[PDB]
RNA sequence: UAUCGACCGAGUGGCUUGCUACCUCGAUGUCGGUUCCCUCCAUCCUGCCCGUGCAGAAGCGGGCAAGGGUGAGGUUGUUCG
RNA sequence: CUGUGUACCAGGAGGGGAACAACCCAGAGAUAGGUUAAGGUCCCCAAGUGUGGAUUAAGUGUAAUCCUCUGAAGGUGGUCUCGAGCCCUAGACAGCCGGGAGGUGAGCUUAGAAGCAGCUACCCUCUAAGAAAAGCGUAACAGCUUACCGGCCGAGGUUUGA
């Protein structure tokens, strides 16, 4: 089986060995596409991913390849971005970029900042009660804001009771 | 150091134990032989499984003792010693007139023997003997 | 006691009454379920085919039919549907509860000895195959490995 | 090959001497 | 199906008990304790988790996990309790 | 434990089986050359890192027999192979967008019940569709839906057996 993925025209990919780099506008991406008997490769300005196994193992990672780059051009021209919104009850949290990190200070009355590093190009831009996470390498955004949601995450006490946290509230 | 090797292989992305099984027969065949590289071996499966397995080795022991290396240096040199029959004259001769090398300590470039190449590009479950000897703890010398 | 025990066809068949005394009534409350007073027309017919020779006691006999035909009251009480257990416990199994000494056993119950691929279970029903589930149960309380059969259904 | 497919597009061709497919169906008539 | 859980059915262990009589009758000293060393996990505590008939506090149940810990005393030779 | 028939150990070497009374080859004068048996041919260790092809990713497995080599009932959209029925370029299956409409808030019941407490019936208009409402949801409404229809898309999909 071959996929042939038409590239953008404000985009351009190349490839060595094993790595991909896709570059728009919005900046540039590489990534890793290693999987037994793939090919992955950049035919003029078409990117192919073929193999000659079709078994449902192969066939599946070569979708996963396949959006994975679709992704990538996404990326790399209208960026990705997810959203999300603080919601406090009792005591009032602040959020904030100190660094390459997000730091939420008093956070459920704690005197103990929590913090998570933001991952890669990552920008993180806070305006009040809302937050948005973006860049173009979709992965590298993606966990950013899972990773905000996450270190709000409480699992001592009653959640339907304690929902003090920053949420996503859109997903790309 | 300096070792007069006859033979100088290449165990880059190799089968460390099919790259073995030649080398002992060949020094026991009279080769001096230099395996180069060590680190870089191969051993394919599932690292999980593979590492509990030279772990175990790592944690069995007594006050009789029961050594094993940790560096690719000497996973690989005792893989070959498994391979002779040491504790005899003939063997122990052979056994001792091979060593393994971190990178290659010569200006040749060690040569890739026949069946023992492992192709990256058609097998993603399989470990280095460098990333055996870190998860066991040894001292990335190389 | 475990089925462990007696699940085996390792011993002479033990079965004839004039010679064997007190033996223990049978667990199994019936072996004629549904409209009985109907008879076998119906659309459907599923079978429990046991896969290997075993000697199954009263006692699962008894746990496997309630289990099945309890379950087959998502019919009702009433409802127009067939079952019957076709096998009878008619092997009478021992225990030797003097060590090795003079072990003949003692009566403790009664098994009924099924071979391999026979049926034990035959319901009959109208498209309302809920029995299919009634065997799984069934299945699920009797030693061997069984598979449920649809004798007369194209009904798809 | 539904009859109800059949059907309609006679219906359909009817009405122009009084789904897209089905009326482009019925216009090659 | 938070939790408890009969019947019946399938197993694992080799800690109890029984069976057997393979080893030992030109001797392998018995129970309990004690002292000192290693280990097992089917985990009692401690670490990290999931569910709840989880507001909280506390329970209850479950998961990973054998690093460390698991003590003092009254009757009884007791083991056990 | 106790019978029976038989070959073996006992009283049976030698080759193999890691070791190993009775499992496999084998019944054996000395000595020698040769060819096989069982069993082996990546190394330890004599002989293949043999050929055509398939499957497996668990180091499953590399364990004939066995006190000795475990693995069961029950389960598995892990993966490979084979088959049957049905749907489909007159556009399927899925996804996304749009429409989901009047009689009517059906009648009964009840203070009230209007798709959705209960009982009963479950009709007809407009139409490309739209239930006397399948699932939430409200005190009841509302609101979210969904059945059903149209669009975008474009190739197999779905159900079942081995
Ligand atoms: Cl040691
Ligand atoms: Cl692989
Ligand atoms: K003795
Ligand atoms: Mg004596
Ligand atoms: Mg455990
Ligand atoms: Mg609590
Ligand atoms: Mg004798
Ligand atoms: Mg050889
Ligand atoms: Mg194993
Ligand atoms: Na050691
Ligand atoms: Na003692
Ligand atoms: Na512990
Ligand atoms: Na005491
Ligand atoms: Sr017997
Ligand atoms: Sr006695
Ligand atoms: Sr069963
Ligand atoms: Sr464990
Ligand atoms: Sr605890
Ligand atoms: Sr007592
Ligand atoms: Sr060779
Ligand atoms: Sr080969
Ligand atoms: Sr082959
Ligand atoms: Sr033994
Ligand atoms: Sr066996
Ligand atoms: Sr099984």
Known sequence: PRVELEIPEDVDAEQDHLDITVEGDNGSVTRRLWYPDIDVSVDGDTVVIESDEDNAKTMSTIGTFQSHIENMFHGVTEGWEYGMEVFYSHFPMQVNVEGDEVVIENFLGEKAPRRTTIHGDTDVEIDGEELTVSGPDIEAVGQTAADIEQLTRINDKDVRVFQDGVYITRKP | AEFDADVIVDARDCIMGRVASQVAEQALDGETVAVVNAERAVITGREEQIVEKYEKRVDIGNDNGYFYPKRPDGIFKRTIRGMLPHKKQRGREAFESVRVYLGNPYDEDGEVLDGTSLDRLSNIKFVTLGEISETLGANKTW | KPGAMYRNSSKPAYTRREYISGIPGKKIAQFDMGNNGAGPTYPAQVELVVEKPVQIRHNALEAARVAANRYVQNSGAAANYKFRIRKFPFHVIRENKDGMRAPFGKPVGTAARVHGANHIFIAWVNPDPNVEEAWRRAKMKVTPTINIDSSPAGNA | ?29
Do not use: G
């Not at chain 4, 009405?15 to 482009?24: G, P, Y």
């Open chain 4, 1 to 29: 090959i539904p009859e109800w497919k059949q059907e309609e597009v006679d219906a359909i061709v009817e009405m122009i001497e009084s789904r897209n497919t089905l009326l482009e169906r019925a216009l090659d008539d």
